[PDB]
Design a protein around this ligand. Sequence first.
Ligand SMILES: Nc1ncnc2c1ncn2[C@@H]1O[C@H](COP(=O)(O)OP(=O)(O)O)[C@@H](O)[C@H]1O
Ligand SMILES: Nc1ncnc2c1ncn2[C@@H]1O[C@H](COP(=O)(O)OP(=O)(O)O)[C@@H](O)[C@H]1O
Ligand SMILES: Nc1ncnc2c1ncn2[C@@H]1O[C@H](COP(=O)(O)OP(=O)(O)O)[C@@H](O)[C@H]1O
Ligand SMILES: Nc1ncnc2c1ncn2[C@@H]1O[C@H](COP(=O)(O)OP(=O)(O)O)[C@@H](O)[C@H]1O
Ligand SMILES: [Mg+2]
Ligand SMILES: [Mg+2]
Ligand SMILES: [Mg+2]
Ligand SMILES: [Mg+2]
Lengths: 138, 138, 370, 370, 370, 370
Amino acid sequence: GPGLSDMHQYSQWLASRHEANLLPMKEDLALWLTNLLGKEITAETFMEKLDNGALLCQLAATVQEKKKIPCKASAPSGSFFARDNTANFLSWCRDLGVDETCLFESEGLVLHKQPREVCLCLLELGRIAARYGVEPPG
Amino acid sequence: GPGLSDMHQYSQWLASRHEANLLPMKEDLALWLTNLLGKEITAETFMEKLDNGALLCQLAATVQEKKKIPCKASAPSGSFFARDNTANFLSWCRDLGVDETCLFESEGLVLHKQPREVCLCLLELGRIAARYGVEPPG
Amino acid sequence: TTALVCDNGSGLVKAGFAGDDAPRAVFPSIVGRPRHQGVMVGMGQKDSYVGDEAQSKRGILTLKYPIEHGIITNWDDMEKIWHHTFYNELRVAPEEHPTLLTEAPLNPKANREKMTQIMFETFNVPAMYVAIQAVLSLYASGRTTGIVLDSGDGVTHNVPIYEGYALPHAIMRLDLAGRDLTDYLMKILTERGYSFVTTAEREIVRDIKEKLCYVALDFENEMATAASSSSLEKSYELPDGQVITIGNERFRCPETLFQPSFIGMESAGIHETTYNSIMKCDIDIRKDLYANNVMSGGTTMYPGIADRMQKEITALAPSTMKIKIIAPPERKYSVWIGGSILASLSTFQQMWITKQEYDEAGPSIVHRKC
Amino acid sequence: TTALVCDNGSGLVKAGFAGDDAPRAVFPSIVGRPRHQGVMVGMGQKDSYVGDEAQSKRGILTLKYPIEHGIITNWDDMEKIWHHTFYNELRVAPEEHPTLLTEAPLNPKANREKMTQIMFETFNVPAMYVAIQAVLSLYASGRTTGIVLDSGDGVTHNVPIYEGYALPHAIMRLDLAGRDLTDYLMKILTERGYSFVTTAEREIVRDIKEKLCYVALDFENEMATAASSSSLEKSYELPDGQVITIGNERFRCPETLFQPSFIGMESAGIHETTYNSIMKCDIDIRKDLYANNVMSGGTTMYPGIADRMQKEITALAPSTMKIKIIAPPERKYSVWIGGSILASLSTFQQMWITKQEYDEAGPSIVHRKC
Amino acid sequence: TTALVCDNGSGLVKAGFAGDDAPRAVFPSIVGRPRHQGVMVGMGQKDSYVGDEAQSKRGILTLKYPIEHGIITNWDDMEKIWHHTFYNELRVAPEEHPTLLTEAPLNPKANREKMTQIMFETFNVPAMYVAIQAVLSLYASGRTTGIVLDSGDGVTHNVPIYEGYALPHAIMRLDLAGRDLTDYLMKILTERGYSFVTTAEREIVRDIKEKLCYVALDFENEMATAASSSSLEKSYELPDGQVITIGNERFRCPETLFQPSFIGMESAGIHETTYNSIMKCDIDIRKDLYANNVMSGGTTMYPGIADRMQKEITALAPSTMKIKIIAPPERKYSVWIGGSILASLSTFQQMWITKQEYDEAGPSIVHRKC
Amino acid sequence: TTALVCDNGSGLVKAGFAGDDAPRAVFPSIVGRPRHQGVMVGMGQKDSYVGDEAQSKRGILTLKYPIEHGIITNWDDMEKIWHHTFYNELRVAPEEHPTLLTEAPLNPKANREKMTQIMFETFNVPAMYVAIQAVLSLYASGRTTGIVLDSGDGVTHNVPIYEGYALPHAIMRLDLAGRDLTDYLMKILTERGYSFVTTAEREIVRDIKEKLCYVALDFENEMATAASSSSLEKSYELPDGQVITIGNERFRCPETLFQPSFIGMESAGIHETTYNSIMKCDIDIRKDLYANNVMSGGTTMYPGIADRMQKEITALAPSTMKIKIIAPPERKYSVWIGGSILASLSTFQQMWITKQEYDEAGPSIVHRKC
Ligand SMILES: Nc1ncnc2c1ncn2[C@@H]1O[C@H](COP(=O)(O)OP(=O)(O)O)[C@@H](O)[C@H]1O
Ligand SMILES: Nc1ncnc2c1ncn2[C@@H]1O[C@H](COP(=O)(O)OP(=O)(O)O)[C@@H](O)[C@H]1O
Ligand SMILES: Nc1ncnc2c1ncn2[C@@H]1O[C@H](COP(=O)(O)OP(=O)(O)O)[C@@H](O)[C@H]1O
Ligand SMILES: Nc1ncnc2c1ncn2[C@@H]1O[C@H](COP(=O)(O)OP(=O)(O)O)[C@@H](O)[C@H]1O
Ligand SMILES: [Mg+2]
Ligand SMILES: [Mg+2]
Ligand SMILES: [Mg+2]
Ligand SMILES: [Mg+2]
């Protein structure tokens, strides 16, 4: 960060731009999901094509074979169906030893409010799935 | 007292039973007040008929005749009127040049908590009154 | 290889890696729990929140601080704050990294024992240490002699050090700091008809004191100035767009550090307590302590407090003593940057408690190494 | 497998299947019975008529609403309306489908108990649920924060919701809604010499209200404008072909939502009940409620009501707040749209009251689960 | 020369002469104004009504309380209530007599300042005083040690006093009292089917509360008993001869004193608020406070509240402590009885504010004498 | 006339008449002043309290000792303690009675001069004397040879005496006694999480010290026993009914007498200081000093201190010497018993300073007679 040079600039960095290494974190996961889902992801499109929860239900359905989970793949963005898909996926994470630190809430994907916690969830799932025959993120 | 023969007996005597000679001090004052005020006092009734402050206001007035002091002579015991009567008497003692040490607080008469300091006040007032024409206690 | 440093104060967590210039994470030491009936399903919600996440949605939450007066009073909520620190805010895996923690002096022994146990058993840390907070403020201020005055959210303390030797009989502790001043500001804002009551409204008056409060140089002259004129009055906008206007409440709040009588406690005040610990030191040490009063922690951040402290100690100390106050602009982080300095030193690497010493002596190892 | 959804309001039944975009059946909540000798020809002699066939034959009938102020007052007529809904409008056996019903807040407890009993004992549904109407209107709005104002035929209510949590102490009800506005329009149409008296003539005035009435932006200027000129006057054709001309009665009717004393009530009016409900909420929630006032129900369909509401709340709230009124063109169906969304969710299917757990606990289960 | 004493609370005015055993005047602290058109010459109409006459005519009036939470919110209507008090009820010229007023602690300073201004400018009193009303409850109790709990219509507070010395940092305030319980009983009567809406119907529910409500010793056993049997149900006749029947609403209403969560508050309840105030006192004071918890004011009048308070504090305090609750038969009047005692004392007569020292200092004289 | 004897140490006043076997008055040498706001009028209340009355009210008082380390540091408060002694407790006019006072050795000359002045000018005594405390302990012991160790509430001293001759160059003094051990017990109870801070809470820790503390015969084996076992722990009930448990704090407090390093002093400790005083005496005196170590004063009252002292001195002295420690059951009163003996002797009656010698020579008469 900016360091001690002045204390106002350091507090402005704590409040926002705090996590500027999020763009690097999206690039690893976009390529990993492009290999694993067979659907093309880029770090610019990453939130804009995950936000209906449908590809994350397909991620669980891909990783599990290596509960059955319900999903509406046709769900539009910003809907209660997009929330409900994402809530099934977050329940599949809670059944897999992830906890309320690394998890996002279903609103946090669907309205884009928690994109760091989406990456931390996908990375925690990757480290657990690595013990059961999945190649983890780069 | 008990002396130092048992070291535990003496430290109880200092706190639980320090003035067995309180009753001898009440006896002289009860007969002196009976001579001076005409209201009849005994060492068994002494606290129970001084405790509304009214006869101590009559004492202040009698010793002054031989500030005007306000009083409510009808006041019941344990009341704030009994405190207020006694606070006028204690102020009259401080105007009679008595220091803060031999005096009681108004609660100490009205709740009977300080009957030693009531006797010390009456004796100190008596020794001052002797210089102004009233015969003191025996 | 590299250590991590967590200050872990009563009000704020400061955390980051050893050798960094400043913390990487700084967030409030609160957990929050929802206090109202949930009615919408599908929302994937947590049953509790911590840090800036709990601060953000505080209108639906009751808020709890696990630490009070520098003592961890709720261990189940402290383990959530430590877990959030290592896994969200720093992305560590603590199994790989030596951890430096910090504590106030004159704490109960069980606090550093259980803090040692949880690091080795819940987090599986390889090596661990607990430093005294005031000693880290001398590492940050670059010197081996001085009397530190440290005040945070819950504890005020002072520690005289001379030539790297502490004088533990002269150490002072005072259970008056920023939370007590926040509660006193809530009390005196009722004089103007403002009512602040919920645990979320306490966080509003904490922001009011951080923005608008200051220390008077002469208190009776400021009381006369504020009685005579509106010139010292300032306004603050509440989260719903209402405006409060405050006057002498701006300096009557901080004055409680110099007059603890304002919050009902029989204690000397911040100027007397540092003079009294200088006078408990040997006569040949005192001149160098008067020249080196070092201020630390966020409760020392009020405008005018160093000029007030300079004035008050000068009236207590002998004439011809040259008393000096060191109050640098980064002093709200000087415990953490002092821990970052210390954990980096090549001559410090023998001092850690290692996991294989804890496997021999248990939690009791913390009383003999720290 | 599929679920039924019924709005079942004081004025209209709106009914269909969960996951559809709109109700399939929409008809008046009326039962009609002949007011003339029971020996009719051509009119199709049967004891009673429901909904659209009662509205069609109204010249020969007395008309009764089974429900008033959100409370069912004839249970045998309510069973006629539900029997018509499942067997004659939706063309379905209720034995096969979960049914989601709706209620206003602050209703009598006996209403949702008897409603639960009739669904399990008369219609023999496998499962059912009783939702709050305002929470469904927020599902249809696509959001988890807002103060919702609902107004149907019989009751108006508001519920503040934030992050999916309701604040049940901040809920308001007023028993002034569309039927009180119809009865007040019948009263003021007497000033021009029009007499409407029969229950069938109340349905003519309901149609005059729906087509001609609107909300004034400023009422005193609109009163002065209608007194000064005929330009605000409009005409309507009665079922017999006579014409009525209406003037200021056209906006004096809807103004009763903002001035309840026109119909004799002491209550504050809809701009004050929404504001007072925001001021019952915690201070940190209020800014997000001011930005999300969601309108709902057929009585919010008047032209100009959102512009009036925006003006009136902006005069109550602090000038730095950003007031928004959300009033979509679908808002007479948003309770049903919300029920269709909710009954379809994966995360809702554990929330139904099932027949076997009603057999454990009787009607009283509706208080623990809904 | 006799002094006047006036309780001047939210809810009720209690007033009379110092040295009398009880107040002469006791009437509701309301102003009433007509809400309907006076169609008839000599109908009896007058511009406004006060006290008992406003309570008597309430079917044609809107009713307003000028005091809320112990704060005077309408000064024109308080000046009307004081004019009624001196000239119609006491039948006094206030020009002749010194007046003792009373107030709750932690009130805004402008409220005391405006009280002394109106007494010296409008009523032209010779001298004036403003007592803290809980110190007067201890005068009426005949003791000089204890923690007083006072609850009227608008506020509840406690003050610990040790030997005529108050501990002002240990004082608590809770803006939950008798009016919050009346409004919660109105909300709860809707479950049973009864709607009370107007300001006149609030006075009916307030009479139901005073006659039918009681405090449960154990709330979950009374809830289970009420669910199991009709044995606890009671009936009440309304002013028009309709009949209310209620059961668990009788004890769910006053239970909100012990758990403020029922009305949405994040606040501890009256037993915890008494215990927390004792724990803010010095350790040597606490034994005498536990032996002297003194009840005061009309909201402490429920059946079973002293037995509940004894039970709840005994579970918080150490097992070797002797808990006692002093709850006098006359505790509805102990603020006024204490003012009648105090204003009569010979030692009190030099601590009035006189008209001459108000003309020197202005109304802010009240902050230095009282 | 009969003489009177005041011991008048830094912790307790012991007072009475010459020739009595015990003091008539024994009370704490404290003055106390209210620290809180008086709110109830009528009490006749004193602005200051002394002795057991100040100990009784201590929760509302700040407490001060006017003597520290055997020096009178507040003369205004010492004149109140002497006035309370003569006029309330001994109940006698000092103009009739010769008065014996006491002092520690190596005190400043101004202390006995000002003490001499006040007795002849404030109290007008006919005659006066100041004795050294430890020579009185030897009169009470009934012997003319021995080395006395006196320790109280601020000063520890020893004087070797042989055949009635003192050796002034061999007198030793430690300003570590009693009050320093109470302050160290307050410091050390923070390790258990108990916090004692007010002047009133120091009187609680002083009571805990008097009844739970003891001297270890071997400190490392008690530290090993207390680390290994709960069998050394005890409980104390605080004045509010809370219970504190203490363990090694019971013997770590008194060990400070043998290791002054525990409280930050460079000083030698009680055993070494006694041995060093004997070794400053002439070689042929030393045998009778080793046989006659006399213990005196209330800080010598700990269980096991005489057995520890015999063991520690035996390790310093030559193996052929017969070490004996004389520790009477009544040694809390040895100085007063010795003063009661001395003032009664027929050979002492020429040694008083009389008022006529003070009127000739002034206060400095006390350096040539005493
Ligand atoms: N500008 C400020 N003015 C006053 N108080 C402040 C200010 N900024 C922060 N504080 C106080 O400083 C506290 C931070 O210190 P804390 O975390 O409790 O202990 P430490 O200094 O050991 O890390 C805050 O919680 C707050 O009470
Ligand atoms: N366009 C409109 N303009 C004004 N009022 C309308 C309009 N459409 C419907 N209403 C009125 O709204 C009420 C019906 O609203 P609705 O939401 O369907 O009520 P409910 O839920 O009780 O069935 C009736 O009073 C009706 O006359
Ligand atoms: N018997 C009672 N039971 C419950 N509440 C009561 C009772 N009698 C009086 N109250 C309440 O006391 C309040 C009267 O106002 P206020 O002056 O503040 O109280 P007070 O009666 O102590 O003078 C009202 O809320 C009233 O309903
Ligand atoms: N049982 C005891 N155990 C420990 N300390 C005690 C005990 N009893 C009394 N003390 C201490 O001994 C002191 C003796 O009184 P002090 O005034 O100093 O006169 P002196 O030195 O002559 O004995 C007390 O004030 C107290 O500090
Ligand atoms: Mg810190
Ligand atoms: Mg409807
Ligand atoms: Mg009242
Ligand atoms: Mg001594």
